Write a protein that binds this ligand. Structure first.
Ligand SMILES: C[C@@H](OP(=O)(O)O)[C@H](NC(=O)CCCCCCS)C(=O)O
Ligand SMILES: C[C@@H](OP(=O)(O)O)[C@H](NC(=O)CCCCCCS)C(=O)O
Ligand SMILES: O=S(=O)(O)CCS
Ligand SMILES: [Ca+2]
Ligand SMILES: [Ca+2]
Ligand SMILES: [Ca+2]
Ligand SMILES: [Ca+2]
Ligand SMILES: [Ca+2]
Ligand SMILES: [Ca+2]
Ligand SMILES: [K+]
Ligand SMILES: [K+]
Ligand SMILES: [K+]
Lengths: 442, 248, 548, 442
């Protein structure tokens, strides 16, 4: 082991699963469930067969409010979905009985696709998933109905949209959690450009699972970005463990103690007390009627503070059953805890900064929107290196219906397909079990 | 090789220009020195400039393709890559732009040929360019009224002729003399004055132009009437269309 | 009757158009030209004032060894030297682009749902009218909430405003008509009913930001500027907190969820934001052009007005400046909208189609393509052969390739009622032309035409697309003159023949049916002539804030 | 096997190595050497330690002609390269003795880096290679010299340039064959955005190896793009085999027969005769003194034609020992062969079209450049789906020094590092051996 830290791991009911698991057993670089989740998300595609069919019969292709009169094609795609799916699968697979999946959902209206891993072994990135899926379904549809050469280009437009005139697949009737590589704010950002509402929908609004999936994606991106290399690696691992994996049951217990009557401030008080009890911080000196706390372990203080931040979001936005205040929680949890202690806030001010901008851009004319449309690649919310967006996911999971741009509005296709995958839907269970499994080889 | 479909004289002339076994008719004599003057890349008696050392002195890696492909002499010597460029009148010049590029890459080694509507160019190693250029200038590739050697300011392929039957030239590099019936090249191809002009001889007469031309026109032989040539073009269109859709 | 280009040829030259010989070299060089003479003198004045040499006829080679021609703007009786059709010298052309660039379409459907479902307030035609009065104060750059705001000068931004439209005739009539694009008044009966059925009960804003801002900034400014002032006007008109959580829903709706950009952003090698010419698909360009709603009994006129719109925008401004610059590409474009040449070839093709098949009644097949595109290509090329003056006029092979293939492609699409077989006809035309004259265009002209046949019906990722969805960023099309505007024409052609009210986006079609625009999109070629004559008055000038 | 085709495989001296190998044994999806090459290129980084040192000592950081007076730092990086490289390796690796490499070159002036494969298993794309490498070297340099907190940001600028103010690593002193994901013309394009000069430099101007590496990268991209899915797969595999792997010795034998005196036209004549001899084409009908050829196998005709195209480039540009005419060969080989036969040219006109634009944009004012600066992602040369760029690589390999923007000018850092790797430098034998290894699994 590179790091001596060990954590106790729990289930999503707060029961002990495994004790004294080495920190690195939770690393994206070591944990086989995190690998499975990331590879799964890279290769999974949602296909809207009903959408393709409707686009063709109306000639409404190529983006919002677009239509080409005279190009209508009336094809019974949903009625022949089994045959179309099987033909597509033959083209998508590399070999028979490899890890390709093409599975119908919604009475043939939707398909879940997992493009085989072998295609990504010899790919630079992840776009093979939508591109291989798209052409396999275009070809399968053409062959199913003997669509003429003259009309086949409409099938292509119905599946993939205005691409390549548009850079994006504008008006496409397929969807992925990931977005195109050109939209990255920086190299290494792809696992950050996943809408909060997609994560929340996929995890069926289970608060801890949403927080876990978001933390997994965010902190795994921090490795791809190089941010979790060398001096910073332990900070990121501890953040993942304590903020997103409920290490030592700290998030869960803070919520338990503050859920009935608590506030952001009462969560802070309990977290500072716990950090002192555990030896993470100590009184460095006294000013007049004011204790100045210090630490010799900034990464662990940061992780404790991050756990409290998640619990504060769960308590504050959970009490409102309204997500909007998460921007406020992310700001004032951090502002309050600095002046409570004399120690730096989560991510050394970057969560607070992210929260200032996020507050502005979710309560102003200038851009942004509701909490659910943000993501780690969004210019407003990219600044903290993994410690802010998972709280937004938790808050949206707790929202009882105050949002216009809800996961039901933005993420229905993704929900239907991606929530089928056990490891996507309940990642906390799989990552904890995998950590336990490899605990003795770290 | 069969080169080009069709049963018109135009089609046969296109085949003849392409076919390295077809000995081009020599129409005029132009000395080696006057080719160098027309080209305008170096002075007569000036040793060939060099863009790199001779191949023997720049130590190429061991390579079966290099061993099997004989360099042209100007490559062996490290000559500059230089050009000669022609404009061909749509009023029945014997050669025309795609005819030239197609023919050049059948007949000549080591050739960079480019086709445009108003200009056609070959770039190759300088001493080889000189040999190619002698052929391009002395034979039926060239007529001194309906073709022009032009490295810039090429306007004219689509213009009406002047009263002498000469193609337009913004820079008037080729001058028809009514008193001799011959054309004189008074400038090199980039437009600089020659101290001693070059005799290009007599223009071809109109019937001979029509006999030798590779352009189809309603007042000559029309493309639409060469139905076998049209058939092959349409065939290619259809087969490209099919292949792009599904090549299975 | 005479071929339609014969008058222009007679005006341009001393000789009759069939004559094969002329006179050169004795015309006075540049001194033959009023416009070149103006330029020589202006260059001297410029150099004297600034102390640096500038325009000088003695540099390089000497213009005007041949006749420097006037051009007839097609469908007009206006003859001008080509320099007057350069976009730099033609304020009408600049304003055409500014009027597109500064326009965005923004829904009110999500916005009204936020008001009703989240804020719990009613939306009525009266609240909409109050909102529109508010946003027509705010949009040009004026305040509605804060104290001590400083504002844009109203006279500098007089061209900026907001209108709405809806398919619901009763709602439309209950909103103050100053703010409404009246679909029933602007479109003939059949087209109006098509367009209203597409829009239905939806309500859409057409927002035009100030030309002076668009010129100072870029196309990607437009939807942002729009959204800020929509946002302020929603706050003022519906009386919510001036910045609460719901404010963000209006921002996201106006900036993303119900915005229609004129152009989508471009990839890095040709990096640009939204509402730049390269992002405007051919079907949108055809729908921006308003010929369809005034010339609806003449599909040739409609299609060739779209070609004029696109040849100018795409070749002169986009390829000739955004993507290159300098002297640029005036005559690569003017070939498609002068001397009634493309008009002659396309009316020929339309008559061939009507005689042989009937409009929109031909099989949508390769056989139809081979028939029509071959016949029309041979007609067009014959004209250059029969009329040496025509060939000297359209002196560049690229110009001729574009014009002949445009007629061939449009004619094929008139017959099939399908733009994709029209496109196949365009490529076949190129191939035939190349073999007929043993030349086609400039060095790089037929990259897309050689790739063309195979990619017409392809379905592969970056190959397959209906023509209406293609545009200047379709990979094969991203570089070269003499195609893009003509493709917009081919996109229009089957829809014009069918009588369709729009080609690709009915909201875009309605959005330019507006007499408060500066450029007259119903008569694009008429406007180019007006600008050539220095008679067009653009928006965006700074005279009010500069010395007299 | 999905396809019944078999090919004979040869070495770059024209000797038979393997007989009747199933076509799919050469597939990027199946062939383990192609996988190794692609993964290798994804994870390899060139580090210019001398360049970092000089940038620091002059404060010339952040791009061309940039300098910050007063920021100079005089650090003996090259003199301490062993220690710095070892420290960087400790941060770049995931575990001791995994497949991480950090190897010094040029007396410590350069380093070859291969970032461990495990980092890419849990990454969306490939940017971890430069980003992990960069921060490891920044941290190692700071630690080597105890660079102060106040000065360390200069080390960062010297390594990675103006990023993130610039989207690219503008002024960086590291280099990769791949370029950033934002610069892709389309999703799936990343293996196409590799400069021809980089391929030529890496293969030490060995013509057949340059062609092979280029064809491997191009056709592998065609799989990632979805172009080689379903109906088109066999066409792409046969192209890879006959154009880039000298299948059946066809390229080699055409060059042998035409190398002494031949032209583009004479290569065409020999290829058509060979296609007829082998039954790939036959006379379909007769016009007047003109035979019209047909084929029942467009993909195999295309592949034969593609082999002739490569041979024609080698003969024409080889005779000139000057690359510029490759644009002309790519155009007129295809133009001529259509009117010679009545069959479609390579890639059904798309090589000819690419060649038209490429000719223009290598002989005009408007853009482009010499052949060596193009690539499959370039707007001029993206249009053919793998059949043009490998000829450009062959032509630049044969150039004797006619280019200003030569591989020596553009690709020196890449050459020094990437040519060390046997499989990059000499890919053909590795791909042939790997095909032999798996032949009985197809
Ligand atoms: C956040 C983002 O907006 P979106 O969330 O993408 O709509 C972004 N705007 C801005 O950053 C607005 C900056 C100027 C106005 C606020 C100044 S404090 C933009 O339009 O690209
Ligand atoms: C090729 C490319 O240039 P580069 O090779 O990237 O310099 C591109 N120019 C163009 O496509 C020029 C198009 C307009 C001029 C030629 C019209 S035929 C551009 O600037 O992005
Ligand atoms: O001569 S080129 O074809 O390169 C440019 C035409 S503007
Ligand atoms: Ca307490
Ligand atoms: Ca007259
Ligand atoms: Ca001049
Ligand atoms: Ca009314
Ligand atoms: Ca009515
Ligand atoms: Ca063996
Ligand atoms: K512990
Ligand atoms: K020499
Ligand atoms: K009505």
């Amino acid at each position: 082991a590179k790091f001596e830290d060990k954590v106790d791991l729990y289930d999503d009911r707060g029961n002990l699963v495994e004790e004294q698991v080495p920190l690195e057993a939770l690393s994206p670089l070591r944990n086989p469930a995190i690998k499975s989740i990331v590879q799964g998300i890279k290769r999974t595609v949602a296909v809207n067969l009903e959408g393709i069919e409707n686009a063709l019969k109306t000639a409404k292709v190529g983006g919002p409010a677009c239509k080409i009169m005279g190009r209508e094609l009336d094809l019974d795609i949903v009625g022949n979905a089994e045959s179309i799916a099987a033909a597509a699968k033959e083209m998508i697979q590399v070999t028979e009985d490899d890890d390709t999946k093409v599975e119908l959902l919604g009475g043939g209206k939707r398909a879940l696709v997992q493009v085989p891993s072998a295609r990504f072994d010899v790919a630079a990135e992840y776009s093979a998933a939508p591109l291989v899926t798209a052409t396999a379904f275009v070809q399968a549809i053409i062959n199913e109905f003997d669509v003429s050469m003259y009309d086949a280009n409409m099938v292509k437009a119905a599946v993939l949209g205005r691409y390549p005139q548009s850079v994006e697949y504008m008006g496409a009737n397929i969807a992925t959690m990931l977005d195109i590589p050109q939209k990255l704010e920086g190299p290494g950002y792809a696992l950050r450009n996943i809408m909060v509402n997609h994560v929340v929908a996929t995890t069926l609004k289970n608060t801890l699972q949403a927080a876990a999936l978001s933390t997994i994606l965010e902190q795994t991106a921090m490795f791809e970005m190089g941010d979790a290399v060398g001096a910073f690696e332990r900070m990121h691992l501890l953040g993942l463990a304590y903020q997103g994996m409920n290490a030592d049951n700290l998030v869960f217990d803070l919520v338990k103690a503050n859920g009935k009557e608590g506030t952001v401030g009462s969560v802070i008080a309990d977290l500072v007390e716990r950090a002192l009890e555990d030896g993470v911080i100590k009184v460095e000196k006294e000013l007049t009627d004011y204790k100045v706390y210090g630490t010799d372990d900034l990464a662990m203080w940061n992780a404790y503070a991050a756990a409290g931040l998640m619990a504060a979001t769960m308590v504050n936005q959970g009490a409102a059953r309204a997500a909007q205040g998460v921007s406020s929680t992310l700001l004032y949890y951090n502002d309050l805890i600095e002046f409570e202690t004399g120690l730096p806030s989560v991510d050394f001010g970057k969560v607070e900064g992210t929260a200032v901008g996020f507050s502005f851009f979710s309560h102003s004319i200038y851009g942004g929107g509701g909490p659910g449309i943000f993501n780690g690649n969004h210019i407003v919310t990219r600044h903290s290196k993994g410690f802010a967006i998972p709280c937004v996911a938790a808050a949206m999971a707790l929202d009882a219906g105050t949002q216009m741009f809800s996961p039901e509005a933005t993420s229905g296709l993704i929900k239907e397909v991606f929530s089928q995958v056990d490891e996507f839907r309940e990642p906390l269970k799989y990552v904890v079990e995998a950590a336990a499994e490899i605990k003795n080889e770290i | 090789a069969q080169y080009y479909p069709g049963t018109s004289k135009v089609a046969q002339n296109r085949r003849n220009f392409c076919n390295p076994e077809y000995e081009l008719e020599k129409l005029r004599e132009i000395s080696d020195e006057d080719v160098v003057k027309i080209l305008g890349h170096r002075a007569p008696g000036e040793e060939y400039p060099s863009v790199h050392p001779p191949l023997e002195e720049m130590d190429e890696p061991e390579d079966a393709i290099r061993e099997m492909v004989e360099p042209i002499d100007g490559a062996k010597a490290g000559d500059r890559v230089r050009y000669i460029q022609f404009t061909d009148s749509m009023y029945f010049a014997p050669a025309q732009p795609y005819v030239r590029s197609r023919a050049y890459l059948c007949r000549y080694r080591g050739a960079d040929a480019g086709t445009l509507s108003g200009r056609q160019i070959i770039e190759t190693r300088e001493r080889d360019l000189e040999k190619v250029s002698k052929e391009l200038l002395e034979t039926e590739f060239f007529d001194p009224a309906r073709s022009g050697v032009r490295g810039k300011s090429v306007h004219g392929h689509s213009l009406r002729l002047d009263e002498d039957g000469m193609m337009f030239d913004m820079l008037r590099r080729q001058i028809y003399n009514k008193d001799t019936g011959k054309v004189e090249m008074v400038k090199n191809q980039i437009g600089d004055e020659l101290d001693e002009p070059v005799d290009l001889g007599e223009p071809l007469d109109e019937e001979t132009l029509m006999d030798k031309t590779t352009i189809y026109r309603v007042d000559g032989e029309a493309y639409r009437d060469d139905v076998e040539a049209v058939e092959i073009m349409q065939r290619i269109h259809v087969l490209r269309s099919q292949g792009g859709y599904n090549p299975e | 009757a005479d071929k339609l280009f014969i008058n222009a040829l007679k005006k341009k030259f001393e000789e009759s158009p069939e004559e094969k010989k002329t006179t050169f070299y004795t015309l006075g060089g540049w001194k033959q030209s009023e416009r070149k003479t103006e330029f020589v003198n202006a260059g001297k004045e410029v150099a004297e004032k600034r102390g640096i040499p500038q325009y000088n006829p003695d540099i390089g080679t000497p213009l005007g060894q041949r006749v420097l021609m006037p051009y007839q703007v097609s469908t007009t009786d206006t003859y001008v030297e080509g320099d007057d059709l350069h976009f730099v010298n033609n304020a009408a052309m600049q304003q055409l682009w500014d009027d597109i660039r500064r326009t965005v379409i923004v829904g009110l459907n999500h916005a009204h749902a936020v008001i009703e479902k989240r804020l719990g307030k009613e939306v009525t035609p009266e609240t909409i009218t109050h909102y529109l009065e508010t946003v027509n104060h705010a949009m040009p750059g004026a305040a509605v909430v804060q104290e001590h705001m400083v504002e844009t000068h109203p006279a500098l931004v007089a061209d900026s405003y907001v209108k709405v439209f809806t398919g619901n005739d009763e709602i439309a009539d209950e909103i103050d008509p100053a703010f409404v694009i009246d679909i029933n008044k602007q479109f003939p009966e059949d087209q109006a009913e098509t367009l209203k059925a597409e829009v239905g009960d939806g309500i859409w804003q057409v927002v035009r930001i100030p030309t002076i801002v668009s010129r100072t900034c870029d196309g990607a400014t437009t939807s942002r500027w729009s959204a800020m002032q929509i946002g302020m006007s929603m706050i003022s008109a519906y009386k919510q907190a001036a910045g609460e959580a719901a404010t963000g829903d209006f921002a996201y709706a106006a900036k993303h969820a119900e915005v229609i950009h004129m152009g989508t952003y471009l990839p890095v090698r040709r990096a640009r934001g939204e509402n730049e010419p390269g992002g405007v698909p051919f079907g949108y360009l055809a729908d921006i052009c308003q010929s369809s709603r005034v010339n609806y009994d003449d599909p040739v006129r409609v299609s060739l007005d779209v070609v004029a719109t696109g040849a100018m925008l795409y070749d002169q401004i986009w390829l000739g400046s955004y993507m290159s610059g300098g002297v640029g590409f005036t005559q690569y474009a003017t070939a498609a909208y002068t001397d009634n040449i493309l008009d002659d070839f396309t009316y020929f093709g339309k008559e061939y189609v009507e005689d042989k098949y009937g409009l929109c009644e031909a099989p949508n097949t390769m056989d139809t393509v081979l028939d029509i595109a071959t016949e029309v290509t041979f007609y067009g090329l014959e004209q250059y052969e029969e009329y040496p003056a025509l060939l000297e006029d359209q002196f560049g092979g690229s110009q001729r390739a574009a014009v002949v293939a445009a007629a061939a492609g449009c004619s094929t699409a008139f017959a099939t009622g399908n733009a994709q077989t029209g496109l196949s006809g365009w490529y076949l035309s190129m191939y035939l032309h190349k073999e007929q004259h043993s030349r086609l265009g400039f060095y790089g002209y037929d990259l897309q035409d050689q790739c063309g046949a195979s990619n017409v019906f392809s379905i592969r990722g970056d190959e397959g697309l209906p023509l209406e969805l293609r545009g200047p960023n379709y990979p094969n099309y991203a570089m070269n003159v003499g195609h893009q505007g003509e493709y917009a024409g081919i996109s229009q052609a089957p829809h014009a023949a069918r009588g369709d009210a729009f080609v690709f986006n009915p909201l875009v079609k309605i959005a330019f049916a507006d007499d408060n625009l500066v450029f007259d999109f119903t008569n694009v070629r008429g406007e180019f002539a007006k600008g050539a004559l220095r008679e067009f008055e653009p928006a965006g000038e700074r005279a009010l804030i500069t010395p007299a």
